[PDB]
Amino acid sequence: MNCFEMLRCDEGLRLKIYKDCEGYYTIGIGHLLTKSPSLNAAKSELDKAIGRNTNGVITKDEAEKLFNQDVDAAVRGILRNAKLKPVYDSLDAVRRCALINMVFQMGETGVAGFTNSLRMLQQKRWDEAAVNLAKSRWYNQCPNRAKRVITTFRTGTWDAYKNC
């Protein structure tokens, strides 16, 4: 399993606009369209992002395209963030995927705010990190997904995605 697979397992795939666990209009494989509460805005965003009049629906390849760009964008923000880069560099392959997962979902600035967890991960205090992450709002809003991501940081295995 790799980072992409991990992501695909958590985000799934939708060809029509829907709202994630965060309550935002999203499409394809975890593609955030807008933080705005208006469908019209998301619709606009969609077309803009696509380059054509989608009228609310996209194609599977279109999704795939957005996804590659979104993953690239997650890796890019980590690498450039002074709070994330060192964490990232210090983790093993599987745990790096969990960090990308968080970034992809919440953004560079969101993750960058989990100061203590970040430190704990970097110091290999896996159980401490886990407890800490579970205290967030993120966990209350997207518990299934968050548990999965958390188990990964705690164990460093793919156990949570084994049935995917």
Coordinates of C-alpha atoms in Angstrom, one line a residue:
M1 CA 0.0 0.0 0.0
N2 CA 1.2 3.5 -0.7
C3 CA 0.2 7.0 0.1
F4 CA -2.1 7.2 -2.8
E5 CA -3.8 4.0 -2.0
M6 CA -4.2 5.1 1.5
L7 CA -5.8 8.3 0.4
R8 CA -8.0 6.6 -2.1
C9 CA -9.2 4.3 0.7
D10 CA -10.2 7.2 2.9
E11 CA -11.6 9.7 0.4
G12 CA -13.3 7.2 -1.9
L13 CA -14.5 8.6 -5.2
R14 CA -17.5 10.7 -6.0
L15 CA -18.3 12.2 -9.4
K16 CA -20.9 14.7 -8.0
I17 CA -20.5 17.4 -5.4
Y18 CA -20.9 16.3 -1.8
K19 CA -19.9 17.5 1.7
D20 CA -17.0 15.8 3.5
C21 CA -17.0 15.1 7.2
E22 CA -15.8 18.7 7.7
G23 CA -19.0 19.9 6.1
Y24 CA -17.4 21.3 2.9
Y25 CA -18.4 20.8 -0.7
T26 CA -16.0 18.4 -2.1
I27 CA -15.7 16.2 -5.3
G28 CA -13.8 13.3 -6.9
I29 CA -11.1 11.8 -4.6
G30 CA -11.2 14.3 -1.6
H31 CA -11.1 17.4 -3.8
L32 CA -12.2 20.4 -1.8
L33 CA -14.1 22.9 -3.9
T34 CA -15.0 25.6 -1.3
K35 CA -15.1 26.4 2.4
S36 CA -18.2 28.5 1.5
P37 CA -21.6 27.3 2.5
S38 CA -23.0 27.9 -1.0
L39 CA -23.5 25.3 -3.7
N40 CA -23.3 27.9 -6.3
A41 CA -19.8 28.9 -5.2
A42 CA -18.7 25.2 -5.2
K43 CA -20.3 24.9 -8.6
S44 CA -18.3 27.9 -9.9
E45 CA -15.2 26.6 -8.4
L46 CA -15.8 23.3 -10.0
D47 CA -16.0 24.6 -13.5
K48 CA -13.0 26.9 -12.9
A49 CA -10.9 23.9 -11.6
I50 CA -12.1 21.7 -14.5
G51 CA -12.0 24.3 -17.3
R52 CA -15.3 23.3 -18.7
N53 CA -19.0 23.5 -17.9
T54 CA -19.4 20.4 -15.7
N55 CA -22.8 21.3 -14.5
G56 CA -21.9 19.5 -11.2
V57 CA -20.5 16.3 -12.4
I58 CA -17.0 15.2 -13.5
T59 CA -15.5 12.2 -15.1
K60 CA -13.4 9.6 -13.4
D61 CA -10.3 10.7 -15.2
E62 CA -11.0 14.3 -14.3
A63 CA -11.0 13.2 -10.7
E64 CA -7.8 11.4 -11.2
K65 CA -6.3 14.5 -12.5
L66 CA -7.4 16.6 -9.6
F67 CA -6.2 14.0 -7.3
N68 CA -2.6 14.0 -8.6
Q69 CA -2.5 17.7 -8.4
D70 CA -3.9 17.6 -4.8
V71 CA -1.4 15.0 -3.7
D72 CA 1.4 17.2 -5.2
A73 CA 0.1 20.2 -3.4
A74 CA 0.1 18.2 0.0
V75 CA 3.8 17.1 -0.6
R76 CA 4.7 20.6 -1.6
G77 CA 3.2 22.3 1.5
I78 CA 4.9 19.9 3.8
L79 CA 8.3 20.4 2.3
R80 CA 8.1 24.0 2.4
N81 CA 6.7 24.2 5.9
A82 CA 9.2 24.6 8.6
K83 CA 6.9 22.9 11.1
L84 CA 6.2 19.9 8.9
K85 CA 9.3 19.2 6.9
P86 CA 11.5 18.0 9.8
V87 CA 8.6 15.8 11.0
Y88 CA 8.2 14.4 7.6
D89 CA 11.9 13.8 7.1
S90 CA 12.1 11.9 10.4
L91 CA 9.3 9.5 9.9
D92 CA 9.3 6.1 8.3
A93 CA 7.5 5.5 5.0
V94 CA 4.3 4.4 6.3
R95 CA 4.0 7.2 8.9
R96 CA 4.9 9.7 6.2
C97 CA 1.9 8.6 4.4
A98 CA -0.2 9.4 7.5
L99 CA 1.2 12.9 7.6
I100 CA 0.4 13.5 3.9
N101 CA -3.1 12.2 4.6
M102 CA -3.6 14.9 7.3
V103 CA -2.2 17.6 5.1
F104 CA -4.3 16.6 2.1
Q105 CA -7.3 16.7 4.2
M106 CA -6.8 19.8 6.4
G107 CA -4.1 21.7 4.8
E108 CA -0.6 22.7 5.7
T109 CA -1.7 25.4 8.3
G110 CA -4.2 23.2 9.9
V111 CA -1.7 20.4 10.7
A112 CA 1.0 22.8 11.5
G113 CA -1.3 23.8 14.4
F114 CA -0.9 20.3 16.1
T115 CA 2.3 21.5 17.8
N116 CA 2.5 18.8 20.5
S117 CA 1.6 15.9 18.4
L118 CA 4.1 17.0 15.8
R119 CA 6.8 17.1 18.4
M120 CA 5.8 13.7 19.8
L121 CA 5.9 12.1 16.5
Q122 CA 9.2 13.5 15.8
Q123 CA 10.5 12.1 19.1
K124 CA 9.0 8.7 18.4
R125 CA 6.5 9.0 21.3
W126 CA 3.8 7.1 19.3
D127 CA 1.3 6.5 22.0
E128 CA 1.6 10.1 23.3
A129 CA 1.1 11.4 19.8
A130 CA -2.0 9.2 19.4
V131 CA -3.7 10.3 22.5
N132 CA -3.0 13.9 21.6
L133 CA -4.4 13.6 18.1
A134 CA -7.6 12.0 19.4
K135 CA -8.2 15.2 21.4
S136 CA -8.8 17.3 18.3
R137 CA -12.1 18.5 16.7
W138 CA -10.8 16.8 13.6
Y139 CA -11.3 13.4 15.5
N140 CA -14.8 14.3 16.6
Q141 CA -15.8 15.4 13.2
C142 CA -14.2 12.5 11.1
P143 CA -13.7 9.7 13.7
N144 CA -13.6 6.8 11.4
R145 CA -11.0 8.4 9.2
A146 CA -9.1 10.0 12.1
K147 CA -9.0 6.6 13.9
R148 CA -7.6 5.0 10.9
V149 CA -4.9 7.7 10.5
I150 CA -4.1 7.6 14.1
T151 CA -3.7 3.9 14.3
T152 CA -1.2 4.3 11.5
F153 CA 0.9 6.7 13.5
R154 CA 0.7 4.6 16.6
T155 CA 1.6 1.4 14.9
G156 CA 3.5 2.3 11.9
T157 CA 1.8 -0.6 10.0
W158 CA -1.0 -0.7 7.4
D159 CA -3.3 -2.6 9.7
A160 CA -6.0 0.0 9.5
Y161 CA -6.2 -0.2 5.7
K162 CA -5.8 -4.0 5.4
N163 CA -9.4 -4.6 4.0
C164 CA -9.3 -1.6 1.8

